[PDB]
């Protein structure tokens, strides 16, 4: 991989955006917002191809001069939605100069919905079949964009895959040059190769080779030692609902502290649940004998 980074808030100016330069996974959310003096020229040579996954949500608000995300996040494949912004895993709001999304590698939003609103230049929305990305599209809120108040000339590559929406077959794409990838039904959420060969049952969205859990772009369940696993086996603990960590790691976060991390139900979690207390030294949550101190 690249690097597992914490959740970030990037505002006012682009200088801090270079902090993403080595992340392949954002273990948290990604907020890019309130950049009023930015112009397209400031984004021309700006790219984060390392980014494959965001465990929580992606929020974009009032970023001036940004016209597409095709160059910014070309390989973002999965938004897990472990933690959501107002029940959304993707939020594009008041992005005044955004013309298209262009997240041509986005295959799955594992939990949560989409909110794309008040983006007056935004097209290539009608060309996205969200049913292939989220199970819950009924809760999507996609309104007040260029497509609503004017006639977008959404020209797809021509050629491009075509899917149905209320009896009408429509070609699906992210930009004028990028189609929406669609896999055979049998591949389910696992993804497939260009040739149509299904990825391993433990993959999510895509893989470098078929039927191999060490060749996944992202995991359906848990990640451990470069492999997509179904469960974190003992002595490993499930962490952030996506990876396996050892006792040592979980202990060093507890002592670094933020949250003083604990062990409960084979998970390394921020706090003991209600009715439980932290048994000192072994970090294990044990039930309270009467009320909790």
């Amino acid at each position: 991989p690249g690097e597992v980074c914490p959740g970030m808030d990037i505002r006012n100016n682009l200088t801090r955006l270079h902090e993403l330069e080595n992340c392949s996974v954002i273990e948290g959310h990604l907020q890019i917002l309130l950049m009023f003096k930015t112009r397209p020229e400031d984004f021309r040579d700006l790219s984060f191809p390392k980014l494959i996954m965001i465990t929580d949500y992606l929020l974009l608000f009032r970023v001036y001069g940004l016209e597409s995300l095709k160059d910014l996040f070309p390989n973002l494949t999965v938004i897990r939605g472990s933690r959501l912004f107002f029940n959304y895993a993707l939020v594009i709001f008041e992005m005044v100069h955004l013309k298209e999304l262009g997240l041509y590698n986005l295959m799955n939003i594992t939990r949560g919905s989409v909110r794309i609103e008040k983006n007056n230049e935004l097209c290539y929305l009608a060309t996205i079949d969200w049913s292939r990305i989220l199970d819950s599209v009924e809760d999507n809120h996609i309104v007040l964009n260029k497509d609503d108040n004017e006639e977008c000339g959404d020209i797809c590559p021509g050629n491009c895959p075509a899917t149905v929406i209320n009896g009408q077959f429509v070609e699906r794409c992210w930009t004028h040059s990028h189609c929406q990838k669609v896999c055979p039904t049998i591949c389910k959420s696992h993804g497939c190769t260009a040739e149509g060969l299904c990825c391993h049952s433990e993959c999510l969205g895509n893989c470098s080779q078929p039927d191999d859990p060490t060749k996944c772009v992202a995991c359906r369940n848990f990640y451990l030692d470069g492999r997509c696993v179904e469960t974190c086996p003992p002595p490993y603990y499930h962490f952030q609902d996506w990876r396996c960590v050892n006792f040592s790691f979980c202990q060093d976060l507890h002592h670094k502290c933020c949250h003083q991390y604990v062990i409960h139900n084979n998970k390394c979690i921020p706090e003991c649940p209600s009715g439980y207390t932290m048994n000192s030294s072994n970090l294990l949550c044990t039930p309270c004998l009467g009320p909790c101190p």
């Binding site: 006012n12 003096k37 009032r62 008041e94």
Partner: peptide, 27 residues
């Protein structure tokens, strides 16, 4: 300035005016 109710788009734009180049704070 003019002391009033600042909601939605107004709020964003009113705040930007208040502190351009200083920008918005976060933790």
């Amino acid at each position: 300035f003019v002391n009033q109710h600042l909601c939605g788009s107004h709020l964003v734009e009113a705040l930007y005016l208040v502190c351009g180049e200083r920008g918005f704070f976060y933790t």
